[PDB]
Every structure is written in structure tokens, then in C-alpha cells.
Amino acid sequence: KAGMTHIVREVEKPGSKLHKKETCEAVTIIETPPLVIVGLVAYVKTPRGLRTLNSVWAQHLSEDVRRRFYKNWCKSKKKAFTKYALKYDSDAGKKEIQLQLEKMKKYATIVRVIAHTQIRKMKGLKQKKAHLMEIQVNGGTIADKVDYGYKFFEKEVPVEAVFQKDEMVDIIGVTKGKGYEGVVTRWGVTRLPRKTHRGLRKVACIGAWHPARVSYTVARAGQNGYHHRTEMNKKIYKMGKSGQESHEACTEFDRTEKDITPMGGFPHYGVVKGDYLMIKGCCVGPKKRVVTLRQSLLKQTSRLALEEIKLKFIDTSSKFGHGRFQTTDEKQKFYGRLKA
Amino acid sequence: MSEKKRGAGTRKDEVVTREYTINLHKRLHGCTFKKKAPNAIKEIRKFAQKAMGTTDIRIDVKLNKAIWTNGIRSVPRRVRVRISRKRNDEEDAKEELYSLVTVAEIPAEGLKGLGTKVVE
RNA sequence: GGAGGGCGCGGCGGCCGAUGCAAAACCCGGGGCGCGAGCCCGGGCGGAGCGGCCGUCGGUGCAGAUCUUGGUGGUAGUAGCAAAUAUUCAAAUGAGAACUUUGAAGGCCGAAGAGGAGAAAGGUUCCAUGUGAACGGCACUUGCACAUGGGUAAGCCGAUCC
RNA sequence: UGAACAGCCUCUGGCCAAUGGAACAAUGUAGGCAAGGGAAGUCGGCAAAACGGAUCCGUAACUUCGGGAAAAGGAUUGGCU
RNA sequence: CACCAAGUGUUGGAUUGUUCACCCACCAAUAGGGAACGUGAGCUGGGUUUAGACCGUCGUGAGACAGGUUAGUUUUACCCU
RNA sequence: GCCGAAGUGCCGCGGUCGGCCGCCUCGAAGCUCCCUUCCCAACGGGCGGUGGGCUGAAUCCUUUGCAGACGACUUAAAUACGCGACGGGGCAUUGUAAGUGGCAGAGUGGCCUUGCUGCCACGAUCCACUGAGAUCCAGUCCCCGCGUCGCACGGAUUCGU
């Protein structure tokens, strides 16, 4: 999660009084680099739930696992160590992969992929550490999908190849850590009201006399934030990348070209100068935390958006007296020059 | 005081001096007004400790005057400090500099010549 | 609740035994006896008097008593040691210095003072010198502590006199 | 400064000894501020908060005619020349 | 009017210490009950219910009052779950 | 080769080799000496003999802020696409400094050479130079500017199926 920006989009509906015309919207910008799929893993369904039989690792790992390794393993690249298995005997390892194909294709395995996030393609985010993760592979018949999956670890997968635009995508992350917080901001209870009072931000009574035991349902303090949460049904307005995916904008009325980072960069993140993904509204997490996007389980859509809704303004705000890249920045710099 | 090198990086020397601008403006804002000035001086000791890699720093009374003149609760944003690293005893010595207002630059090269003068 | 038959302790008249070549006492996941009360014996510790048996007699047997008196836990290395605007740097000394002492610096009381003195009160606490066993709920070489010395001189000030 | 022996700052005199360091979490305790609303809160405006000094103007039904009265309510207030 | 159903809602104020009560007003609805008459080392302390005190009644009196009225100290968690 | 599971075991081949009263003998059925199960399977471990092979990890101090009551989380640094304070530039904030000049300036003094530019001061304040100065990563961004740390860590420590 890179931060948040804003986009203005020109609606269209008819039910309430006002409809159509421009509307402000919050949008989360996420840097979503292309991700290096390492392996095709065979999970067979069992009556105890899925069980991996073996995990396949790519033929050429030597930087991928070596950036990964300050969790995943440990030690911050010191003396040339932290060890992962080195690639097999030439025809022994290939035979092992094809032995898995037989097992998969007899019980009809639910095909899954281990991949890792190459954060080393990003620079502004100070972490250099790849996160190994499991992403399920969906598709057709078992024989075809597994065969493709072997070839698919020998190459990146981009943003455009996993999500279609307009799609309702459930976004799942872990919330920002707040620390330890009161009852009032953890359960949303009232302050106790008086002129003065020996407890303010408190609940009064946590049970009743006869059940000699405090319920799980009564509200008292504890950790808040750093919680897994799912926030559903987010419209994926735009997918793109700096220079060589997207253009930028189409000039004049559409909008003038504006890089999607705000000038001066995102506070406490870094500066976006790579992949970007516009996902609807708020998104869980702080900034510089892993957020995962996973396709909506309720494939129904129905009518929320449905129709696309052409990008007018980005609000990638450089303002408070100036701004909108290049020319307006030059105007301010004109009132500088020899000490700015 | 041993800025020693052997097999690893630039600078095969011991004692020299360098003028660096010391950041008081961090951490200090988090600290109380009441303890602001005694916390501020402690920051200076910490930076020297890391840079040299040596525990023992004595800090001059002239430096103490600079921080504390503004008061306990008011501390300056930054101060340019000279960090010298001399003695058989192995002490770090810090003192004040002067500048009206201007810039931080390449003082270090001229200071190598200054450190030679202390010797001979 | 009564009666019955016993056991243990202290001392006394009787009687017999035991001892510095190791008494009594005390210790003992050591043995054995008696239904028990208790007893017996060994080993270790110890160093001067003691026990059994027959009579006699009690300030005679304990788990308590919101018990009495002494000791010692868990609590607990836990609550805490948070008011009084505030310390810091270098040097001296010393085994050892955030706190002593000196300088430098920052401050504070803000003259109805955190001031210079007298009353009352305490009684040597004042000061030197020695100095860290206890004590200054931190520390400490410092102390209003401990030790060792000295010090209060009036015809005119007070008491006195009234 | 100002009516000030008020407060605040400082002189002179006196301390620097209020165990010290670090993080400075929730929760407390103590101190502030909050858009819009304005006591609906609550047994109750409890205290926070506001008013406040003064000069000028203005000043009530009532009253033992002495008062209420600084009623209320307004305006004004600097630097400097 | 009756059924399955506590899944999910079931209100704000005025007054009274009163929950209850009784209004105003909203509303899909403003159901009813329990949990040491849920709920004081969570609070408040207004009622009840001390010591001060006033009034009325009763009492020769002291005092009493299911009569009114006012002002009246809310301690301790760091142990175990 | 199969059974994917919880396959970790099953089944097939071929010699080799043990056992086979399967069949036939020898002294022999006596070696736990005339009731005292008298241990006899093998899932596992211990312990030697000898034929190979594996050539390290983790943890501390330090650091980041992604994170935190403290552990922890999450980054970084031991010789490198390595790393660090400033500065410069971007980004911010506030609002135009010091110094200098001025029939700018309410005005007022004081010396005359008595001023159609009189001069010297004083003077709140205003303006020019000046959208200036000051601050700006700490939880902003960047650099190939500048110098070092960067001890090719040895300082501190632990672990065996």
C-alpha cells in the first residue's frame, strides 16, 4: 500500500435526485510490481483438507532466495550464508517434476502456486525482503493446467494478467498497528458521563453476580490494529505502470498528464515510480505493508458500477497555493532560483 | 584515538578532525520540555559514540553553554560541532565552531592539514 | 458423660545402674517392639553429669483461644521511592564520583523570599581535624552522623530592680 | 511593569539536594484546545469556560430614600510624534 | 387474530431520587422479563437511613413521626483465577 | 511399478544367502546339568568395527520505522548493483529579514553659506533591493556533490537427529 490519492469520475444512474456529473472519490494506490512465480505445488484434497505432496522450486534461484532471507530464514546478508538447496542432478530433478504430474492427474489435484514478491524491483520502500506466499491457480482440466504451470514459473506475471478492469475485487490486508487502545476505540463504547468520575473511558459492569465469570462478549481494553481484515467489493478502476504500460493521460479535457504520485512523494512510504493499481475507496493497512487483492467470491456482480466511468481528474494533490506538475511548479521555482 | 583500518575501506589514519552538523531536532521533540536540554546534550554523545566506535567522549563546557543558553525547554534545531578524536587515553573531544549562516561543505580536507599541525 | 486399667514429664524418700577409655541434650526417606499412650536400640553431633524401678507429690503433657512472647515465609524483589520549574559540562581528589569540592554554564526563591537574625524550643547540633561499622529509605571519599578537640568573657545588653 | 508589600521578571542575599537514566504505550493524575450546536447532559450548570481592570455614556420596577449601582447594557483602551 | 422465530431492532426530551409513573414528539417498532430486587475496591451519592437544623402533629417532658424540608467523609487489587 | 493418504507400505523378477522333520543321515536331540516362564519376536535405542557423504546455521550489541509497554514485529550493516551525517535541488510552512538606500514618513528640532534640489541629525512606521529570510525529516523526496564509518566484524554468545 503506497498511500491514497483521489480520482473524479462522471457517474451515471437515475434513482436519487442528483445523479450523473462529476463526483469526488477516494482511491487507494498500491504498488503492484510483477511477481516472480517460483513453483508449481501439488495439493491433493484429502478428508482432512488439502495436503501438499511435494513442492517444486525453480531451476535458477540465486538472487530470489538471497534477498528473501532476513525473515523466511534470518541474518541481514553478512558472511555469504543462509542456505537453500542447490539445483538437482539434471535429469533426476526433471523426472521428479513429472512424477508429480502423474499423482496430480490421477486424483485431480487442486493446483496451487508458490510465488514470491520481488520488492527488490522497488527502491522507495526500504525493505528489500521478498515475501513467499501461496496463490491458488484456477482454470480448466488438470492435465492442461499443471503442464502450463511448469512453464509459468519460468517467467513473471504482471498486474494486467490477473485482474480485468471494472472487476469487483475483495481486498484483504492487515490493519495499521495502533498499539494498545482503550475500550472506547476498540469496541466503540460510550464515555461514562459525569462532571468528574474516577473512570471516564471505562465500562461500568462486566457481568452479573451469579455467573462467576466474565463473559467473552463484554467490552474491555486490549490491542487494537494489526488485525487481519477483509473489505469487499472494490472496483478496480485502473491498472497501470510508469512509462511502458500506460501512457499517462490523454491531454486537454480528459485530463492533462499527471504522474500518479503526489509531488513530494507519499508521506512515510517512499515515492511511487513503478506499478500502480487504483482500487476503490479505503484500504486496510498503514503504508509499507503487504496488501493482497483476491477476486470476489460473490461472482454475481449486479449493479453498483457495472459500466466504466472514464478517468477525468486525478487528485494527486500538489496544491495549497500552486501545483499540477511541470508548468505550475516552474512558476513557483521562478519565485526562487538562487536560493531555491 | 584510533580511526584504524586494515583491510577494509578508505582512510589508513588515526586522529584527525571533521566538522559535522549535529541533529538535535529529532527524538528531542518527543522528549519533555523539562528534560529537553539534558536530553539534547546526550544526543551529541551518542552520535560520537557510533561514529568513532568508542565509548569514551568528554564534551567541552563551551559546547554545554551553546545548548543551555536558550534554556532547559528551548534547545536549538542544529549546531555545527567539531569532532576530534585524539589521545593515548582514547577520548573524543567536541567543541563549538562559528558560522553566521551559510552551508556545510568539504571542511574535512583542510582539517586533515589542521590535524597534522597538532602533531608537528 | 461416668467409671475402669495404663503411658509420659518434673521434683522428693527408698533401691539399683550408667560415665570424659565420652553423660545428658540434639540430629538421623537407620533397625525393632507395643492396639496405643510411648518405648527400645544403632550411627552422627556433643562434652559433665544422668536414667530405670518401688513409694511420694505437682506450677504435669497442647493445635487452636480475633491466643501471649520470640523467630521465619509466601506476598515480593512486587506496590513503590512521582508535589516543591532543573539540571549539565570540565577539572581537583580518591580504589571507586550524576550527587563531594572548585570553575564554567543553565536556573530557582523573586525581597510578606528558599533571605540576614532574635524569641520559644533543642543543647553543642556551631567549627576544625579524623572519617564510612551503623545512619543520611539512591549513591557517596561528603554530613546537622560517629570519633577527637575547641569555643559563649559585659559598671553601660538582658536578667537583676520595680 | 502596575494601585500594589498583587502576579510576573530581575537585583541583593540563598540553594542547585528535591534518587538518576531510558522509553516517553494503553490506563491514570495534572494542564490545554476543539468545527457546527449550545445544558438537549445531570438529582442539580458541580467545575471547566466566559465576564473581569479603567474612562466615558447609560442605568430599572422598588426602597426603611441611606441604597439597589460597578444594576443591566454598550463604546473606548497601542506604538510614536 | 394465530403460527415458525431472540436473527436483528425496540428511541429522545419535560418533571419526579423514583425504576415505575405521566406527558410531548419521532417511528418499521417505540414488546415484556431475568441475571445476589444484574451492575458502588466502575461511578454518582439525588432517595432510603446517623450526628446539625427548621416547621406541623402527637407527647407534662425527654423524644417520636409509614409527615414535610435542608446541609452532611464512598477506603484498599500489586495476590490468585 | 502401483496405492497421494493419512502414498512411507504393497506386489512382481532374478540370482546370492540364511532358515525350512520339505526330504534323508551322522555322533547327537545330553551344553539353563532330577518343578522354579528362567530373557529366545522386533517397532526403537545404546555401543563399538569400516565403506561412503553432508562443509554450517542461529543468537547478542548496533540499526530501520514498516513496529513496540519490555520481549517481539519489521529493515539495515562486515567488502558490497553495500551502507551513513550534512549540503545542494525538489517538496513543505510562514509571509517579505539583517544590511543598505529613499521629496516614502505624522512631524519636530538645531547650525549657517539663509538655500525653486540647504545641510546635519532625530522619527513610530512604509517601500525597494526581497514571493524574501528562517525552517524543512525526524514518521517528506532525491543525489552519484563531500568526507568517514564501512575494522575483507571477532567483539559478545548458544545449539546435534
Task: Identify the three-state secondary structure at position A237.
Answer: strand
State chain A's maximal CA–CA distance in angstroms: 81
CA-CA distances (angstroms) from residue A301 to A16, A278, A283, A298?
21, 19, 20, 7
- The residue numbers preceding gaps of C to N over 2.5 A in chain B are none
Cα gap A135→A112, rounded to integer Å: 6
Q: Where are the alpha helices (DSSP H) in A18-141?
A: 64-67, 92-107
Determine how many CB atoms are found less than 10 A away from the CB of residue B77. Answer: 8
Element (H, E) at B19: strand B17-23
Give the pairing of strands B91-96 and B78-86.
antiparallel
Annotated binding site of A for Mg(2+): 319
DSSP A189: P
User: What residues contact B108, with CB distance under 8 A and at least 6 apart?
Assistant: B16, B18, B19
Distance A199 CA to E34 C1' (A): 28
Residues A134/A41, Cβ–Cβ less than 8 Å: yes
**C-alpha angle A223-A214-A208 in degrees, rounded to nearest 5:** 135
Phi, psi of A132 (to 5 degrees): -70, 140
A200 touches strand E (CB under 7 A): no
Amino acid type, A177: G
- Which nucleotide in the DNA or RNA is closest to residue A218, CA to C1'? E39
B27 touches strand C (CB under 7 A): no
- Which nucleotide in the DNA or RNA is closest to residue B42, CA to C1'? C88
Which amino acid residue lies closest to nucleotide F155, measuring CA to C1'? Answer: B53
Cα gap A100→A109, rounded to integer Å: 10
Q: How many CA atoms lie within 13 A of A98 on its CB side?
A: 5
User: What residues contact A248, with CB distance under 8 A and at least 6 apart?
Assistant: A257, A258, A259
Cα gap A33→A157, rounded to integer Å: 9
Distance A192 CA to F117 C1' (A): 81
* b/e map B34-50, b = 16+ CB within 10 Å: eebbebbbebbeebbee
Task: Identify the three-state secondary structure at position B43.
Answer: helix
This structure's resolution (Å) is 5.5
Cα gap A121→A70, rounded to integer Å: 17
Residue ranges of E strands in chain A = 3-9, 23-30, 36-44, 51-55, 110-116, 132-136, 168-174, 177-181, 222-225, 228-240, 276-280, 291-295, 311-315
Sheet with A51-55: strands ordered across: A51-55, A36-44, A110-116, A132-136
Amino acid type, A247: H
A199 touches strand E (CB under 7 A): yes
Q: Which three cell numbers stand for residue A100?
A: 508429480
A196 touches strand E (CB under 7 A): yes
Cα gap A160→A260, rounded to integer Å: 18
Q: Is A323 left (phi over 0), alpha (psi -120 to 50) or beta?
A: left
B64 touches strand C (CB under 7 A): yes
B58 touches strand C (CB under 7 A): yes
Task: Identify the three-state secondary structure at position A145.
Answer: helix
Residues A38/A131, Cβ–Cβ less than 8 Å: no
